[PDB]
Write a protein that holds these residues in place. Structure first.
Motif, short mmCIF file in Angstrom:
data_model
loop_
_atom_site.label_atom_id
_atom_site.label_comp_id
_atom_site.label_asym_id
_atom_site.label_seq_id
_atom_site.Cartn_x
_atom_site.Cartn_y
_atom_site.Cartn_z
N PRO A 197 8.16 -15.76 -4.97
CA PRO A 197 6.71 -15.19 -4.78
C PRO A 197 6.57 -13.87 -5.43
CG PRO A 197 7.19 -16.42 -2.87
CD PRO A 197 8.33 -16.54 -3.63
N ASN A 198 5.58 -13.64 -5.81
CA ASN A 198 4.81 -12.07 -6.39
C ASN A 198 4.37 -11.45 -4.92
OD1 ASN A 198 3.39 -14.03 -8.18
ND2 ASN A 198 4.58 -12.43 -9.40
N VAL A 199 4.92 -10.27 -4.68
CA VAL A 199 4.77 -9.32 -3.79
C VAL A 199 3.64 -8.50 -4.13
CG1 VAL A 199 5.49 -7.62 -2.04
CG2 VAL A 199 7.26 -9.42 -3.07
N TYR A 200 2.65 -8.31 -3.28
CA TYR A 200 1.31 -7.58 -3.29
C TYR A 200 1.10 -6.54 -2.17
CZ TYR A 200 0.14 -10.99 -6.90
OH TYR A 200 -0.01 -12.14 -7.91
N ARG A 201 0.92 -5.31 -2.66
CA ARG A 201 0.93 -4.18 -1.70
C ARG A 201 -0.49 -3.58 -1.73
NH1 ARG A 201 0.61 0.69 -3.48
NH2 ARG A 201 0.81 0.98 -1.14
N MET A 202 -1.19 -2.99 -0.76
CA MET A 202 -2.29 -2.04 -0.64
C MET A 202 -2.34 -1.44 0.49
SD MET A 202 -6.30 -3.99 -1.00
CE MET A 202 -7.60 -2.69 -0.84
N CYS A 203 -3.09 -0.11 0.40
CA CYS A 203 -3.72 0.72 1.43
C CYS A 203 -4.80 0.36 1.91
CB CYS A 203 -3.42 1.98 1.29
SG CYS A 203 -1.60 2.77 0.74
N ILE A 204 -5.18 0.35 3.03
CA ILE A 204 -6.57 -0.14 3.45
C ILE A 204 -6.83 0.71 4.72
CG2 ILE A 204 -5.52 -1.99 5.14
CD1 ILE A 204 -9.01 -1.88 3.26
N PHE A 205 -8.13 1.42 4.75
CA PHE A 205 -8.83 2.00 5.85
C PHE A 205 -9.49 1.18 6.81
CE2 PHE A 205 -7.88 6.38 4.76
CZ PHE A 205 -7.39 6.17 3.45
N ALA A 206 -9.23 1.07 7.99
CA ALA A 206 -9.89 0.09 9.01
C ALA A 206 -9.82 0.48 10.26
CB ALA A 206 -9.03 -1.38 8.94
N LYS A 207 -10.65 0.01 11.31
CA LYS A 207 -10.60 0.49 12.59
C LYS A 207 -9.61 0.09 13.46
CE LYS A 207 -14.84 2.58 12.91
NZ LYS A 207 -15.08 3.76 13.98
N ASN A 208 -8.79 -0.97 12.94
CA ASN A 208 -7.65 -1.63 13.72
C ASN A 208 -7.05 -2.58 12.54
OD1 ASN A 208 -8.72 -4.57 14.07
ND2 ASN A 208 -10.30 -3.14 15.00
N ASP A 209 -5.55 -2.97 13.22
CA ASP A 209 -4.80 -3.54 12.50
C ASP A 209 -5.20 -5.06 11.99
OD1 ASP A 209 -1.41 -3.46 12.52
OD2 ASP A 209 -2.11 -5.30 11.95
N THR A 210 -6.04 -5.78 13.09
CA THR A 210 -6.57 -6.97 12.78
C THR A 210 -7.61 -7.25 11.83
OG1 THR A 210 -5.97 -7.69 14.98
CG2 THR A 210 -7.64 -9.09 13.67
N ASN A 211 -8.37 -6.17 11.91
CA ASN A 211 -9.38 -5.95 10.85
C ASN A 211 -8.87 -5.54 9.44
OD1 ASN A 211 -11.99 -4.13 12.77
ND2 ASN A 211 -11.30 -6.30 12.80
N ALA A 212 -7.55 -4.80 9.44
CA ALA A 212 -6.92 -4.37 8.34
C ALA A 212 -6.25 -5.44 7.59
CB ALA A 212 -5.94 -3.27 8.63
N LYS A 213 -5.70 -6.59 8.37
CA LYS A 213 -5.41 -7.55 7.91
C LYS A 213 -6.30 -8.45 7.05
CE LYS A 213 -1.53 -8.56 11.24
NZ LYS A 213 -1.72 -7.87 12.27
N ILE B 17 7.24 -5.41 -6.89
CA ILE B 17 6.18 -5.37 -6.01
C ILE B 17 4.76 -4.92 -6.82
CG2 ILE B 17 7.13 -3.22 -5.11
CD1 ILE B 17 5.69 -3.76 -2.17
N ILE B 18 3.65 -5.36 -6.46
CA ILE B 18 2.54 -5.13 -7.17
C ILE B 18 1.58 -4.53 -6.54
CG2 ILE B 18 0.96 -6.19 -8.86
CD1 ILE B 18 2.72 -8.50 -9.42
N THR B 19 0.84 -3.55 -7.05
CA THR B 19 -0.06 -2.86 -6.16
C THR B 19 -1.61 -3.31 -6.44
OG1 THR B 19 0.86 -0.75 -5.82
CG2 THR B 19 -1.52 -0.65 -5.58
N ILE B 20 -2.41 -3.87 -5.60
CA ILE B 20 -3.69 -4.45 -5.64
C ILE B 20 -4.84 -3.52 -4.93
CG2 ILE B 20 -2.89 -6.59 -5.90
CD1 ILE B 20 -3.95 -7.51 -3.00
N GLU B 21 -6.02 -3.69 -5.57
CA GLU B 21 -7.12 -2.93 -5.27
C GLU B 21 -8.53 -3.86 -5.42
OE1 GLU B 21 -6.81 -0.48 -9.77
OE2 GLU B 21 -7.15 0.73 -7.88
N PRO B 22 -9.65 -3.60 -4.92
CA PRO B 22 -10.72 -4.31 -5.44
C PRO B 22 -11.10 -3.94 -7.10
CG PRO B 22 -10.94 -3.04 -3.38
CD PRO B 22 -9.98 -2.39 -4.05
N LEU B 23 -12.15 -4.71 -7.73
CA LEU B 23 -12.33 -4.61 -9.01
C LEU B 23 -13.72 -3.90 -9.20
CD1 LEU B 23 -11.40 -8.06 -10.14
CD2 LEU B 23 -9.85 -6.05 -9.90
N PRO B 24 -13.72 -2.69 -9.97
CA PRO B 24 -15.17 -2.31 -10.70
C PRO B 24 -15.86 -3.50 -11.20
CG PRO B 24 -13.36 -0.85 -10.93
CD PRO B 24 -12.84 -2.07 -10.54
#
Lengths: 180, 155, 97, 66, 223, 186, 125
Positions: A27-43, B146-153
């Motif tokens: 599988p392709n691994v996908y990462r992101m940083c996310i600003f949220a009020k909690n972990d469940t919302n972040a997921k 490992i691939i970085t994702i983000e929303p799209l313009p």
RNA sequence: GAAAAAAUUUUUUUUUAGAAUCUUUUUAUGAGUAGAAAAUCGUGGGGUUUGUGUUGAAGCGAAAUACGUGAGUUUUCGUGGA
RNA sequence: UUCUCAAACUCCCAAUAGGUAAAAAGGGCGAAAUAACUCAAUUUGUAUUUCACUCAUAUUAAAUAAAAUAACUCCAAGUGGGCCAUUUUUGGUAAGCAGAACUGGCGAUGAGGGAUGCUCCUAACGCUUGGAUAAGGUGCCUAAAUAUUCGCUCAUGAGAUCCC
RNA sequence: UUCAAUUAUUUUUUUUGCUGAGGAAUUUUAAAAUUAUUUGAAUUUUUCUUCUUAUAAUUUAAGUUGUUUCUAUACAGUACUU
């Protein structure tokens, strides 16, 4: 515990992948940083983006990691630039805006406050694409450019707002708005 | 209301694509009779022992067979009650049902598991899986995979 | 009289709930090990602030070394997170025109 | 003015109020609709089985009883 | 007479010894498992690997919606779920059919993963058990082991700590113990509740739906 | 507000007490209630329920049926929760020891003559409080006059039952709806 | 509110008055529920007029008890004292209204000799 | 089948259950028109029983530290004269 | 090749809703019996029967279930004018219009909110005490903040919360 | 001068509000708890360290009790009931 009161919202690094299959054994691994009020919302926010970007859904994926991010210095100012896509009554608009803060989370809070205040835009209708530190010379906004000058001072621009104890209904003499 | 027999012709009675006069030899020969469950499906070819509209795609037990006719016990909801009705249909209309085949394969496989367990005098469960919650796992991930994702313009 | 079976007993009359977390006897009745758990807790507590004050130096010196080695590795991991965001931001910014 | 036309309202709920009944005759489907000739042959077989059984039962009871 | 009474006291003493010992072994094992998860996760993250921690097996599902005006499928699922009173909480074993049932009632229930301290504490303060007969239940507060040592004696999970263990780990006998237990009717949820409508993954307030670990915080308030 | 069906009530059906005012029968249900509760024997529990049951729905037993039933029993103690009626259709020689709710005078006299025992329910309780080595019997319902009258419509097709009919006369109910020639038949 | 006295709680002050009897002279003052009719006050429109139900009922221990701590027993003849006397602790005498003075005096005197309280002995002088 | 208290070991005082549609106990539950049921309450007469009457009944008016969830019951004072 | 099309057209084609299925009065693999059916083939098959040997089940033949408060029979009542809401929806310019579908209400039922109000929201009720909340609010009327925090806004008819 | 924050498992504490059904003649009994003893073990090693061996008591067990006031040294009063 501290004694600290106001302002809360957090930053999360989340990493996930598609469920392993016979068809794809890596599988392709996908990462992101996310600003949220909690972990469940972040997921859930990660999942909304995973759903919008890829054909992955919660039922077809797996969480590899989720961990809270803490800012490098809490008390050192940075200029954060944020690019947003937000929705109007008619449709979609892009914006890239600049915020002076000591925290990325604080900058997002200012951004949500601005989107609500200046456009009446709801949290649902905003999509944050990248918040990153921008150099002082580079900055577009004049309101941030003014802060970045050599020397700054004011003669007190704000009205008093004493504790509850001293907000009593009657005063003995007429007061003043502020000292000179 | 105003309800004659075959009403809903353009709906249910409409033929499958390019399926005309299908009547080959293997169609007839299945033979499980009085105990069997059987599906009632319309045939484009055969008008002679065609069922009423309601019985299309339904399943029920065979209770009587003749030369090329089949009696089938089918459940029908009549307002406040589901009741068993004796549907006469033809050989072309009846299709062998597959629910029995799932039970049988599971019985055979479980029987083999039982027989294996019995030879060893083992204590083990032949009961079906629940598809339970996933346990712990491991993967080693280089920076390249490992691939970085983000929303799209808008574009 | 012989044939008919022995007398049975009615239900007990209602009592108080006796349901406090600090109702120690009832809690011991309910959980026989809870006394051991109290003893374990007491062994941790008994040492008290003076021993803990002495211990605090020993903890901080051995935790400094462990944290620093684990932290440097983790700082590289954090840098990889930073690097990935930056790589995407640059690539896209170039791509757009 | 006009009287009501379609309505099927509340009937599903009324059906679920007393529960949706299902049949419970179960075993031994019966009488006239049974296959001609074959079931008469079964009746003759059953009568044969019964005669052999009756012969066994009568002899066994009579020999022990007296 | 005296021998039977004496024998019964001896049997009670043996059980107390066994339960005390079982509790100690459990206490070490659960804590050790948690410590191993830390060790595994710490080992993977530093040494450039990804440890995927297990699914949590149980879910505490709390109803948080009235009994007026219910959809019919939702009404059916509620009967099976056993949340017949509007502030009932109950433990549910996570599988696929249970998850889909939880999905059908989703805006009307909050749910999440119940931590081991919380599960014990809730069971201690609000534990009732069915002491009657099958479909002639009688609702009694759990203030001794003898009642549940009757009911769960065949299953060998007799005594409250063993039940707590089955709840903690999603043990070999979950369903029967859960079924014997009453569905926990909870207090209103103190300070900081709010927003009955919708669900928790709206950015606006409202605890309804999945809230994972944060179920415990809510449970602590409404204990 | 709880969601329970039938508002959570368990609602028992059928007789909730014996409604007879007969002193002896009230004394007997007291006795058998005591015997059922203390012994926890299934035989006693059946007797208590059958004693409470409606007097009309309590059956007569035929002497021919009683003897026919008892044939494979070398223990002689028949118990019948109903009335035992005599037979005028066969020789009726073989005696029994029978406890019954009521005996016809002719039946009782024959049973006593034959060398049998006609046993009271108090005597049964005293001698056989556990019901062991005995035979409990019921007379048949056997489609009584109301049962013949009722049972999901006599006028519907494919049904066998008695309607109201006063059919001692000649020109009584035989035509349209009961006749294949005249309209249709049931 | 309600009237506690020792372990005797009486839960109803203010006996109910039949609806609309305040407005209309014809309607009897003594309570009747409008059970036989639709009436829009059995429909529980708040503050219109409260109405009774079983829940207000006395506790099982105190069920018919007087503040005397003794059940009332009405007496119209002297001989009716004789079974009552061994339970004098738990029962109190009421002498019937219709008792002629010579007899009433005799009953009062005898009852006092029998050592049980008589609640209307201080009347009909 | 004995518990307590008052006295001055020995006297006195309070209590001392067995009605099986009854009594003790536990837990659950409580919307309601049309409508069905049960438990009660009250009125006229009769058989039956054991009482009330001219030192005043019924009736009536005013009420009652009254009783009952309630319908109502009971009572006091006044009238009243069978 | 090309533009636009139909819900009264269909290559293809959902979700939702719906049907059958998950073993002990039965099923396995065998022998023997019975026949006036079947087949050259009265053990060729069939079906039935009698004997066997034996299928998980300490808890389980996937879950979950105050699953018997279930069944079943009887006798009789009232009712047969409905009306409201979301979503889907037909006629009609439209209608608080006419007519539906699925569900929930109201009717027959209310307490708190929606200033107010038959249907919206919260929530369905023995009698009481205490608690903590819901919908909903917290300048005064009117119970709680002239709360905190960042925006925006001056209006010679500003603007103020679903159903409204 | 510091030693964070947030989870995790825990252990308390300062004031204080409300409540007290009940009444255990063969289950208010039994065990638990705690204390003072006694004997054998344990282990983080102990002034709330653990078990079990024996002994007594007690209550955290096993649903409020106590003390001092007052009404009152009354005979119905303006208090008390209503």
């Amino acid at each position: 515990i501290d004694n600290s009161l106001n302002t809360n919202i957090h930053q999360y690094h989340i990493v996930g992948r598609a469920i392993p299959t016979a068809k794809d054994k890596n599988p392709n691994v996908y990462r992101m940083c996310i600003f949220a009020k909690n972990d469940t919302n972040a997921k859930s926010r990660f999942w909304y983006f995973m759903k919008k970007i890829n054909k992955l859904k919660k039922s077809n994926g797996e969480l590899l990691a989720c961990e809270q991010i803490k800012e490098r210095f809490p008390l050192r100012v940075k200029n954060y630039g944020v690019l947003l896509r937000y929705d109007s009554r008619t449709g979609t608009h892009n914006m890239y805006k600049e915020f002076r803060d000591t925290t990325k989370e604080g900058a997002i809070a200012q951004l949500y406050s601005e989107m609500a205040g200046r456009h009446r835009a709801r949290a649902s209708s905003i999509n944050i694409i990248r918040i990153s530190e921008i150099s002082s010379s580079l900055v577009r906004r004049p309101h941030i450019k003014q802060l970045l000058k050599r020397r700054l001072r004011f003669p007190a621009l704000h009205l008093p707002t004493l504790q509850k104890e001293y907000r009593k209904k009657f005063a003995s003499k007429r007061p003043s708005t502020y000292r000179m | 209301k105003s309800r004659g027999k075959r009403s809903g012709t353009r709906y249910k009675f409409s033929k499958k694509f390019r399926k005309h006069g299908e009547c080959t030899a293997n169609k007839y020969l299945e033979k499980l009779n009085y105990g069997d469950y059987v599906d009632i499906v319309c045939d484009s070819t055969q008008q002679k022992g065609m069922p009423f509209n309601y019985y299309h795609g339904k399943t029920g037990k065979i209770f009587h067979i003749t030369k090329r006719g089949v009696g089938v016990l089918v459940n029908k909801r009549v307002k406040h009650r589901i009741e068993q009705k004796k549907v006469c249909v033809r050989i072309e209309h009846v299709r062998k049902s597959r629910c029995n085949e799932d039970f049988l394969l599971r019985k055979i496989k479980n029987a083999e598991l039982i027989k294996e367990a019995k030879l060893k005098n083992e204590h083990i469960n032949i009961k079906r899986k629940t598809e339970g919650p996933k346990p712990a796992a491991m993967i080693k991930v280089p920076p390249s995979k490992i691939i970085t994702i983000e929303p799209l313009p808008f574009y | 009289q012989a044939s008919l079976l022995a007398k049975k007993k009615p239900c007990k009359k209602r009592l108080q709930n006796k349901n406090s977390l600090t109702n120690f006897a009832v809690r011991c009745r309910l959980n026989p090990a809870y006394k051991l758990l109290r003893s374990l807790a007491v062994l941790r507590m008994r040492k008290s602030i003076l021993e803990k004050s002495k211990n605090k130096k020993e903890k901080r010196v051995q935790k400094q070394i462990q944290k620093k080695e684990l932290q440097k590795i983790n700082h590289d991991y954090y840098k990889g997170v930073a690097k990935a965001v930056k790589k995407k931001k640059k690539r896209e910014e170039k791509k757009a025109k | 003015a006009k009287s009501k036309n379609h309505t099927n309202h509340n009937q599903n709920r009324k059906a679920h109020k007393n529960g949706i009944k299902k049949p419970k005759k179960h075993k031994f489907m019966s009488r006239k609709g049974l296959d001609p000739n074959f079931f008469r042959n079964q009746k003759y077989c059953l009568k044969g089985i019964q005669k052999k059984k009756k012969e066994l039962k009568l002899k066994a009871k009579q020999e022990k009883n007296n | 007479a005296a021998k039977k009474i004496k024998t019964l006291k001896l049997i009670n003493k043996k059980k107390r010894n066994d339960l005390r010992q079982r509790t100690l072994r459990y206490e070490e094992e659960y804590e050790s498992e948690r410590k191993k998860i830390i060790e595994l996760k710490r080992e993977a993250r530093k040494n450039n690997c990804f440890y995927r921690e297990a699914e949590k097996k149980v879910v505490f599902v709390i109803r948080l919606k009235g009994v007026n005006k219910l959809p019919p499928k939702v009404r059916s699922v509620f009967r099976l779920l056993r949340l017949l009173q509007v502030h009932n909480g109950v433990f549910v074993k996570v599988n696929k059919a249970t998850k889909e049932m939880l999905k059908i009632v989703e805006p009307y229930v909050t749910y999440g993963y119940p931590t081991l301290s919380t599960v014990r504490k809730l069971l201690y303060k609000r534990g009732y058990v069915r002491v009657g007969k099958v479909r002639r239940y009688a609702r009694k507060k759990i203030q001794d082991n003898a009642d549940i040592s009757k009911h769960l004696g065949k299953y060998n999970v007799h005594g409250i700590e063993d039940m707590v263990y089955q709840l903690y780990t999603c043990g070999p006998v979950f369903k029967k113990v859960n079924n014997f237990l009453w569905a926990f009717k909870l207090k209103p949820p103190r300070k900081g509740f709010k927003a009955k409508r919708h669900a928790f993954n709206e950015p606006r307030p409202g605890d309804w739906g999945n809230r994972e670990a944060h179920i415990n915080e809510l449970i602590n308030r409404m204990i | 507000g709880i969601a329970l069906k039938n508002v959570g009530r368990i609602k028992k059906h059928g007789r909730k007490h014996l409604v007879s005012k007969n002193p002896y029968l009230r004394l007997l249900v007291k006795l058998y209630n005591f015997l059922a509760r203390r012994t926890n024997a299934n035989f006693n529990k059946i007797i208590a329920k059958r004693l409470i049951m409606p007097k009309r729905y309590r059956p007569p037993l035929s002497l021919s049926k009683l003897q026919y039933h008892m044939a494979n029993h070398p223990n002689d103690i028949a118990v019948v929760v109903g009335s035992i009626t005599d037979d005028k259709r066969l020789f009726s020689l073989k005696q029994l020891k029978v406890c019954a709710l009521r005996f016809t005078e002719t039946a009782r006299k024959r049973i006593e003559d034959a060398g049998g025992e006609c046993l009271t329910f108090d005597q049964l309780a005293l001698k056989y409080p556990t019901g062991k080595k005995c035979v409990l019997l019921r007379g048949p319902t056997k489609a009584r006059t109301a049962e013949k009258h009722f049972g999901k419509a006599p006028g519907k097709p494919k049904s066998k039952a008695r309607p109201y009919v006063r059919s001692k006369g000649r020109k009584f109910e035989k035509a349209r709806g009961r006749r294949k020639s005249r309209a249709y038949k049931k | 509110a309600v009237k506690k006295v020792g372990k005797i709680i009486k839960k109803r002050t203010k006996k109910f008055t039949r609806f609309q009897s305040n407005r209309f002279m014809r309607v009897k003052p003594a309570w009747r529920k409008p059970r036989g009719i639709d009436c829009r006050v059995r429909r529980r429109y708040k503050g219109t007029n409260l109405m009774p139900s079983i829940g207000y009922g006395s506790n099982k221990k105190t069920k018919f008890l007087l503040p005397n701590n003794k059940y009332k027993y009405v007496v119209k003849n002297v001989k009716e004292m004789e079974p009552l006397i061994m339970n004098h602790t738990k029962y109190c005498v009421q002498i019937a209204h219709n008792v002629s003075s010579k007899k009433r005096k005799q009953i009062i005197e005898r009852a006092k000799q029998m050592n049980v309280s008589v609640i209307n002995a201080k009347a009909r002088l």
